[PDB]
């Protein structure tokens, strides 16, 4: 009834979707061929027999990642027509993914999404998985979000985006794509749960004892975050939280909608054996500045909204005591215009351990979505890099000779400056 459609764009989105759907199949007992040896309805559809087709599309402008999906262990899980692929990728170019290469694919993606929506009864919204500093993860994501806003102008559109890291980076033109995507989607998005590869690397090293993690472990952690977010739709709990609940409780103003994701019980097997992870402990770990999965120090800013999504053996009184302890803390400061900055969700299903993963089996877990003004510093860094590269006008010819104008660069930079001003304004205390 509360069906939701997940859209995975680009290599980052497709691989995170691989991890997410592996986790969903494990959680709901669905075999990797769609058969089982309700709860599995907001994300899967039943076709006559036991076949459960996931309610998602995998769209990329490059055949490689989608073909890996098509021939992997989950080759028979996804509908072959919902694994949409192009011929030539966007080559880390926003213009290619938005204007030149993305226009030859957007119609097919919209047709498939329309088929999925028609197959649904009540559509809660969309989950868009993508990366900020990619070609199709930026241009095609922005194009798709604007087309969805044109079509489904009322359904919520939550996006899980890999924010560029402060120091580590795999591409040279990431600031351009990030600024342009922020412009276009900020026009047409509800809330964007943000994450950094560098922060997850640090989390893995410090907590999971892994010194050489790959993208696979990062995707597993992100999939755990997404599972914690969607558990209320997929399972039954004391306090249910829907997508509209996220949108309402985490977005104070239409432009300030970039919360940061966190996951407390990130722990290895032996350490989990030696610990007694409780509600208070996991909450304190969530509010620890070193456990943030976006490399921004929360002490540099003020929280405006927090969404604590507990799951498993969790008692509401313990949650209330832990939240009261957090509020009594002095290092954790909130904005003065949000006397109540905690949306609490509790689910009865403990997190499922993926066979072959690094996370240990725990009795309870919490995912914390925090909207804070500490993201303003990350925005400032991103626009500073954009300003340097645009002042030298580097790489601009690649974007211009592909259906874009330098005026769009200037407009996007001005919009980002306005966003920084808005963050500064909401940061200050009322007088």
């Amino acid at each position: 009834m509360r069906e939701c459609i997940s859209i995975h764009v680009g290599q980052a989105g497709v691989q995170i979707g691989n991890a997410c759907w592996e986790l969903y199949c494990l959680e709901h007992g669905i075999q990797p061929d769609g058969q089982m040896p309700d709860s599995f309805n907001t994300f899967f559809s039943e076709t006559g027999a036991g076949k459960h087709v996931p309610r998602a599309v995998f769209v990329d402008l490059e055949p490689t990642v989608i073909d890996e999906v098509r021939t992997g262990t989950y080759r028979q899980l996804f509908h072959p027509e919902q694994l949409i692929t192009g011929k030539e990728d966007a080559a880390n170019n926003y213009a290619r993914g938005h204007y030149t290469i993305g226009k030859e694919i957007i119609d097919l993606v919209l047709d498939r999404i329309r088929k999925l929506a028609d197959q649904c009864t009540g559509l809660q919204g969309f989950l868009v998985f993508h990366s900020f500093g990619g070609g199709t993860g930026s241009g095609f994501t922005s194009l798709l979000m604007e087309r969805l806003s044109v079509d489904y102008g009322k359904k919520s559109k939550l996006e899980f985006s890999i924010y560029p890291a402060p120091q580590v980076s795999t591409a040279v033109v990431e600031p351009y794509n990030s600024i342009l995507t922020t412009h276009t989607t900020l026009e047409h998005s509800d809330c964007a749960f943000m994450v950094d590869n560098e922060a997850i690397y640090d989390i893995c090293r410090r907590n999971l004892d892994i010194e050489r993690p790959t993208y696979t472990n990062l995707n597993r952690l992100i999939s755990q975050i997404v599972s914690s977010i969607t558990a209320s739709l997929r399972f039954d709990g004391a306090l249910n939280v829907d997508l509209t609940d996220f949108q309402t409780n985490l977005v104070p103003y239409p432009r300030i909608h970039f919360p940061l994701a966190t996951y407390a019980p990130v722990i290895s097997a032996e350490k989990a054996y030696h610990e007694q992870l409780s509600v208070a402990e996991i909450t304190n770990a969530c509010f620890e500045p070193a456990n943030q999965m976006v490399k921004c120090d929360p002490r540099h800013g003020k929280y405006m909204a927090c969404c604590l999504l507990y799951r498993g053996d969790v008692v509401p009184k313990d949650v209330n005591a832990a939240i009261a302890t957090i509020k009594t803390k002095r290092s954790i400061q909130f904005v003065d215009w949000c006397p109540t900055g905690f949306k609490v969700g509790i689910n009865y299903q403990p997190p499922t351990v993926v066979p072959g993963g690094d996370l240990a089996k725990v009795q309870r877990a919490v995912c914390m979505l925090s909207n804070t003004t500490a993201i303003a510093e990350a925005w400032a860094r991103l626009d500073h890099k954009f300003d340097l590269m645009y002042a030298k006008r580097a790489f601009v010819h690649w974007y211009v000779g592909e259906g874009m104008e330098e005026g769009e660069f200037s407009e996007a930079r001005e919009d980002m400056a306005a966003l920084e001003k808005d963050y500064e304004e909401v940061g200050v205390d009322s007088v």
Partner: protein, 403 residues
Amino acid sequence: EIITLQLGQCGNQIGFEFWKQLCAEHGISPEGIVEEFATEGTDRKDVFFYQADDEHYIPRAVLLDLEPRVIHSILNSPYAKLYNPENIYLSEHNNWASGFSQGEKIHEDIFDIIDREADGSDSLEGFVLCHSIAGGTGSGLGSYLLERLNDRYPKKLVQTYSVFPNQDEMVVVQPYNSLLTLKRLTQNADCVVLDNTALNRIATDSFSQINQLVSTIMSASTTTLRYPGYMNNDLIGLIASLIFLMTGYTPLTTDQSVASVRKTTVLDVMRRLLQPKNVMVSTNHCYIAILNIIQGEVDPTQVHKSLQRIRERKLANFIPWGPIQVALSRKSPYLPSAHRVSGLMMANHTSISSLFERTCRQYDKLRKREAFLEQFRKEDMFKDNFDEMDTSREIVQQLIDEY
């Protein structure tokens, strides 16, 4: 007779455990069958249940919800078959404005169900509402139902068990929903405040246990109505003897805390019901009214002595401008009488005003900066302006001034 309207996840659960307690008390089988030992029962059942040709009993309950998951889980419980599938309603597909908009949208079927249930009772007395005021579902849907009900049925009582948001623990948009629900409660509600903070405080010193306690409170409140006696044989009798409320129950003891079988008089109980600690909710503020319902063996001489001693000890304070009550009931003959004598207290006290002063302070702490109003503007009700909000705030201020 009576009807129960429970909304939101909070209300849905509240109802689940309330009916669990009721069926436990009246010896009603999970499937609606009646146990052999209870065949000749004397307890009155019409008040909360109506029997069926199949000899099973059906609650006078209606399930409402914006989401399916909670009720779907309920129908997977051993108690699933008991409820009436016809009455249960689920939206096919967290904001107050959205809730009220849906309420405007789904008027017809809800009132169809309510009318069907109403016409099956000869002497319906009032309404019972269970909901939470913070979440989008409970707040808005209860607002809409209260408005259209007070409009539809101008000769029936409306009683609510409203759950208030925790404050020591930081719904991010709770101030708006709470303020609007309070507006509607003052403007339409006939008459039981509830808060998670103090409730869990007393629980300490899962939602399953919290709401078990809440259902205990509700059942103990309705006991005498369920079990006819001499006095207080009607809900209106209850309301007249008091008229916002707060509650407390003495024997709130775990199943493991029966080891201390303390010789429990009536005096000690009625005394315990007075302390702020036992008041389950969190300017020389004073009382307006106090009612103590006592279960088990009771000697009115003991009651008179306790009243005399408490009056002399002046442990309480009363209004200077106006001139309590101790009613007695009988325990169900089935549940073990682990307590020699037990006591429940419902009172009206001026201190409750503080609650609103907090929420007002919360709301004023947001309206000055226009926080999280984007979603509200989406709905028709707040599409043009927010005069609704201003009127609600001024109404609450007027109520605080009146207190």
